[PDB]
Design a protein around this ligand. Structure first.
Ligand SMILES: O=C(N[C@H](CO)Cc1ccccc1)c1ccc(-c2ccncc2)cc1
Lengths: 328, 18
């Protein structure tokens, strides 16, 4: 499977799709989220009646924040990947002011919203989601991609209750070490905080944080200020809730391992150390991939998304930052 | 409790990237 997937990915990676729609082809309905250099809107493609999520990036804001290369990485990778638990990019294009990525709409909202409301997920519920992340990272890492943005805010729940990973803004295709300080404080591996060259093992550490947060209802390292979070991470002293199973604690001690020669996902057996762990004994990896497992939770409707202030989309009469985004 | 400490913290909302 992975061999065929790499062939498919490389053809798209080497020859990326460009300019596959236009802003006038979509009716903009409502804002689903906002970020430093734009917003995500629910849109309707008038030709088909399909709903999509449109990520709008202001070129000038990307340039001001020195995020050009990361924005080019995001679109180049997202247009090339194909996996059941990844958001599907349908179109991309740009105009004088903005870049646009149009993705299949995932109506269930963020895992973040459901997790905070419910409090915590039971171990079988958390295991169901964690299995999907394990398979997704096995897929991404096999293509030499590092994701670097795992958190419940970036995991969307589809109509079948399965996950769709979004936000490839920090994704990068890299064969060696990399050094960028990026991610979310609670999810940073110690080697990122300590300004070391790091690798895909940072995604496995982030999975450890995610599983802990899903099962506990709070992350393993938190504090009001990021500097305080970093001190807790680099110490790596993790305390587990009394309701955590012995198998769950063993798995987390292996993922939330400061020692790279000991961290699960980063050993000679790679992902198999995770797949074969006792916590995952009840997991049928193939049925998860095939979406045959009954989901523990089933969510143009935007009710599973928070409300955001609307703003008119202004397109300048002059092209901005043309050379910087020529390949988009 | 750790849960009460989390809920009273300023980090329960959507977390921004660094
Ligand atoms: O990348 C995403 N948002 C950034 C924070 O994660 C913020 C941002 C950053 C810069 C510009 C705009 C937004 C994102 C979120 C949701 C969906 C989405 C897909 C499908 N169905 C519903 C929703 C697509 C992309």
């Amino acid at each position: 499977f992975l061999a065929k997937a790499k062939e498919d990915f490389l053809k798209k990676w080497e020859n990326p799709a460009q300019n596959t729609a236009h802003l006038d082809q979509f009716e903009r309905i409502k804002t689903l989220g906002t970020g430093s250099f734009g917003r995500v809107m629910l849109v309707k493609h008038m030709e088909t009646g399909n709903h999509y999520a449109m990520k709008i990036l202001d070129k000038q804001k990307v340039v001001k924040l020195k995020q050009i290369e990361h924005t080019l990485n995001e679109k180049r990778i997202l247009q090339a990947v194909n996996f059941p638990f990844l958001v599907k990019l349908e179109f991309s294009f740009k105009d004088n002011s903005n870049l646009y990525m149009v993705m299949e709409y995932v109506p269930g909202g963020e895992m973040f919203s459901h997790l905070r409301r419910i409090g915590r997920f039971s171990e079988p519920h958390a295991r169901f989601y964690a299995a999907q992340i394990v398979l997704t990272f096995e897929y991404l890492h096999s293509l030499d991609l590092i994701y670097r943005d795992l958190k419940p805010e970036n995991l969307l729940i589809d109509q079948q209750g399965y996950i769709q990973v979004t936000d490839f803004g920090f994704a990068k295709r890299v064969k060696g070490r990399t050094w960028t300080l990026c991610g979310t404080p609670e999810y940073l591996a110690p080697e990122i905080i300590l300004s070391k060259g790091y690798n895909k093992a940072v995604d496995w550490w982030a999975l450890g944080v995610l599983i802990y947060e899903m099962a506990a209802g709070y992350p393993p390292f938190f504090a009001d200020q990021p500097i305080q979070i970093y001190e807790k991470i680099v110490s790596g002293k993790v305390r587990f809730p009394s309701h955590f199973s012995s198998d769950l604690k063993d798995l987390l001690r292996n993922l939330l391992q400061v020692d790279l020669t000991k961290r699960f996902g980063n050993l000679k057996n790679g992902v198999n150390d995770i797949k074969n762990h006792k916590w995952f004994a009840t997991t049928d990896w193939i049925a998860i991939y095939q979406r045959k497992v009954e989901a523990p939770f089933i969510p143009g409707d935007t009710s599973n998304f928070d409300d955001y202030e609307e703003e008119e989309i202004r397109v300048s009469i002059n092209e901005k930052c043309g050379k910087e985004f020529s390949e988009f | 409790t750790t849960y009460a400490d989390f809920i009273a913290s300023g980090r329960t909302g959507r977390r921004n990237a660094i």
